[PDB]
Design a protein that fits this description.
430 residues, alpha+beta, 4 domains, five-stranded antiparallel β-sheet, 14 helices, 39% helix, binds magnesium ion, DNA-binding, DNA-directed DNA polymerase activity, DNA damage
Length: 430
DNA sequence: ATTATGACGCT
DNA sequence: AGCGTCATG
């Protein structure tokens, strides 16, 4: 009762750019705006692989991981933008730079954790305290929340989507106790006001729209963000969790979309995240381990403690290329030429990183895949990264992987390589 | 023949 | 250290 902590101590947002690479290309080329359009990598094989899709194109069933030729079957007027190619490979610099634009705006409002190229967690607890002290018991106007959904509302005693949104927001705001500076629901609401401001700033200053979730922890904020896309934000209160989770497939919660989630479903004979509440913490630990079990026990009650890490920059800088089927690398000359191309992109990005961010990577990780192995990586070997020099990096990479050549001949490479990956890691300030 | 990343856990 | 899992622009 009075001692059961409810995980309502923080205000956490998750901001996710809508169809991010598409928006980057639509900003650059206005002919693509407000059209079904997608971004593809490469072009020769089945038209290129789609990696981002505008919401107009999603209405036709176009999805990521679809070949552009197949997408064109669903969407004959689909417009396509291609990722830049440099040194024979896809080069994502434009999108990384656009991401930095967005991350720097977000960082004006609060500490952020860069969770991916297009999404960041925001710890708003402090900012909310500040804004609450400035409001001085002033109620919160619905006008301050023009794109906010309150998950679970309206309920009880309305034909159009915006009307529903406003009905729910009105129910929520009329129930609020703005006299209480420590009300978690009030804190979430002020958090949503700040996120409206953040999203307005991002769109004003970059052109890019985003969606966002506001809740008490990262998992709920991420879940919330997905509920109303695009260009909307969703507040998931602690009180909304039982109904929300009662029909939520386990695979929708971040980290449960893979093998672990499938085992939770199969071992416990459940489907929805709310069904987890009927197990003791010890039961969950016995099936899924101490860490997972404790996490599941709290998470199915809406409680999670994982902090928003203060980290706006990537921890690693990597370059990767697949060589599928017939294009696999079967000669030493091939392997060395591509190691060099990857190393040259890596050197460029590393030198820029050192200039922008006052750090140097100290470890080079070399990963390969060989023909036949169904794993992402067949082999991972690290070595010292002591100078930002592509020729040295490519030579060292060849050094750590050359023993994998089964071929008795010096010039041939067997089994041929279907993937090369160079990753710079272990940064130190400089 | 989706690809190209990136974070983090396990042992 | 090297491997595996999860996410998925
Ligand atoms: Mg996104
Ligand atoms: Mg994202
Ligand atoms: Mg996505």
């Amino acid at each position: 009762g009075p001692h059961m902590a409810t995980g309502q101590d923080r205000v956490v947002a998750l901001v996710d750019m809508d169809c991010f690479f598409v928006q980057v290309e639509q900003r650059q080329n206005p002919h693509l705006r407000n059209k079904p359009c997608a971004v593809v990598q490469y072009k020769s094989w089945k038209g290129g692989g789609i990696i981002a899709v505008s919401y107009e194109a999603r209405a036709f069933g176009v999805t990521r991981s679809m070949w552009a030729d197949d997408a064109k079957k669903l969407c004959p007027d689909l417009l396509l933008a291609q990722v830049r190619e440099s040194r024979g490979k896809a080069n994502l610099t434009k999108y990384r730079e656009a991401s930095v634009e967005v991350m720097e705006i977000m960082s004006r409002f609060a500490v952020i954790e860069r969770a991916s190229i297009d999404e960041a967690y925001v710890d708003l607890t402090s900012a909310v305290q500040e804004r609450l002290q400035k409001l001085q018991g002033q109620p919160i106007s619905a006008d301050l929340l023009p794109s906010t959904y309150i998950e679970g509302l309206p309920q009880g005693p309305t034909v159009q989507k915006e009307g529903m949104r406003k009905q729910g927001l009105f129910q929520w705001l009329d129930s609020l106790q703005i006299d209480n500076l420590t009300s978690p629901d009030l804190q979430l609401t002020v958090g949503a006001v700040i996120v409206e401001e953040m999203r307005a700033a991002i769109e004003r200053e970059t052109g890019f729209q985003c969606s966002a979730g506001i809740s008490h922890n990262k998992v709920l904020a991420k879940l919330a963000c997905g509920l109303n896309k695009p260009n909307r934000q969703t507040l998931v209160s602690h009180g909304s969790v039982p109904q929300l989770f009662s029909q939520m497939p386990i695979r929708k919660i971040r980290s449960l979309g893979g093998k672990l989630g499938a085992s939770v479903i199969e071992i416990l004979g459940i489907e929805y995240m709310g069904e987890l509440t009927q197990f003791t913490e010890s039961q969950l630990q016995s099936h899924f381990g101490e860490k997972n079990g404790s996490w599941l026990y709290a998470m199915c009650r809406g409680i999670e403690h994982d902090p928003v890490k203060p980290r706006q920059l990537p921890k690693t800088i990597g370059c990767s290329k697949n060589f599928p089927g017939k294009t696999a690398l079967a000669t030493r000359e091939q392997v060395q030429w591509w190691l060099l191309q990857l190393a040259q992109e890596l050197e460029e990005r590393l030198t820029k990183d050192r200039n922008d961010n006052d750090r140097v990577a100290t470890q080079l990780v070399v990963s390969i895949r060989v023909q036949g192995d169904k794993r992402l990586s067949s082999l991972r070997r690290c070595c010292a990264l002591t100078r930002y020099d592509a020729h040295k990096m490519s030579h060292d990479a060849f050094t750590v992987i050359k023993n994998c050549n089964t071929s008795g001949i010096q010039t041939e490479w067997s089994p041929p390589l279907t993937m090369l990956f160079l990753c710079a890691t272990k940064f130190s300030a400089s």
